Design a protein around this ligand. Structure first.
Ligand SMILES: Cn1cc(C(F)(F)F)nc1[C@H]1CCCNC1
Ligand SMILES: Cn1cc(C(F)(F)F)nc1[C@H]1CCCNC1
Lengths: 197, 197
């Protein structure tokens, strides 16, 4: 047995499992299946840990899974003092993707919602700390005012709402879902199902 | 999109990942790759948690993975007071397999080694507690004597040694390895490697 050619096959299968788990994480996120998302995320992290080295494509995949995990935990709320949406905002800006009108839309919605979710939980000191971390040198003039006067139900927040953020993210998720829908593992699995029907 | 036919495909792929991870756990166990075994075991447990229901074949697979994890931790040495080899002995007796001459050989070696590893760590009280749990109503007359006189280097233990146990287990592992070597995921992965060479 050639240990090298066996490890090479294990690496090909690890990459195949990663793409399938990303696709399952995207669908669970879109479908609102919380427990399924939690279980699939655990499987993806374990598969990723087995891989010693990742390609640029695989890095993009794991970063999407990490971004979705953070968005899923936004209203919850580890190793750092930053909030889950602030953490999603760092991932979002570092994913190797085109910075189109949808990228900026999601980015500003996450920035706004990182503050709004603190205010809605009654954490006004945290909203102030999140604000200074996100804006420390376009909407800063308005947000500082809203946070200062503790106006949780300002009309600005009703336009840039959690649902508005969640819909823009869910439409980004649908593009990733169409791109990876043709990956090896899911395509081979769907073929088996159709053979039984 | 038919949510039912998507979940069906996800279940087919989960079963495919389980067989591949079992095969990778068997090879890592046989190869002495401790860290690889640890990482693959973590991946297998996460995949198993995603599956709501398992077939008899899949139950046999997870039980082999659990048995190997326990054997790997035998000289270490959670939720119970039983030792890892005592736990391997419960799995061994409940795996749906033929009780051949190799089954009884592995069983008696595990029974003997569950006591011997306690004595070798200087845990003579634990060796006595393990003995009464394993024998509480063939070698009991001899083992009680060896444990009573704290004879860690008795010739009985040199015949039924950790290596003797480990070799019989490694030859069982090789039969499982030949049986699952033809599973979908590993066979498809190996085909890709040969296409590149
Ligand atoms: C490394 N990694 C991969 C993933 C996954 F989302 F599953 F893709 N998640 C993590 C880590 C990132 C830091 C916090 N803990 C989890
Ligand atoms: C359920 N399960 C599956 C496996 C695996 F070995 F990965 F196959 N291990 C467990 C559990 C068994 C009880 C102790 N903790 C781990």
């Amino acid at each position: 047995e050639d240990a090298g050619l066996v490890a090479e096959a294990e690496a090909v299968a690890a990459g195949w499992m990663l793409d399938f788990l990303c696709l399952s994480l995207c669908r669970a996120f879109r479908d609102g299946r919380s427990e399924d998302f939690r279980r699939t995320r655990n499987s993806a992290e374990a598969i990723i840990h087995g891989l010693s080295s990742l390609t640029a494509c695989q890095l993009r995949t794991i970063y999407i899974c990490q971004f979705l995990t953070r968005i899923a935990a936004g209203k919850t709320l580890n190793d750092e003092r930053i909030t889950p949406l602030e953490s999603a905002l760092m991932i979002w800006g570092s994913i190797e993707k085109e910075h189109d009108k949808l990228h900026e839309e999601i980015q500003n919605l996450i920035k706004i919602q990182a503050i709004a979710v603190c205010m809605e939980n009654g954490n006004f000191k945290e909203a102030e700390e999140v604000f200074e971390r996100i804006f420390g040198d376009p909407f800063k003039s308005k947000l500082l005012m809203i946070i200062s006067q503790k106006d949780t139900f300002h009309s600005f927040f009703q336009h840039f709402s959690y649902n508005h953020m969640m819909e823009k993210i869910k439409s980004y998720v649908n593009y990733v879902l169409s791109e990876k829908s043709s990956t090896f593992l899911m395509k081979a699995a769907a073929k088996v199902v159709e053979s039984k029907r």
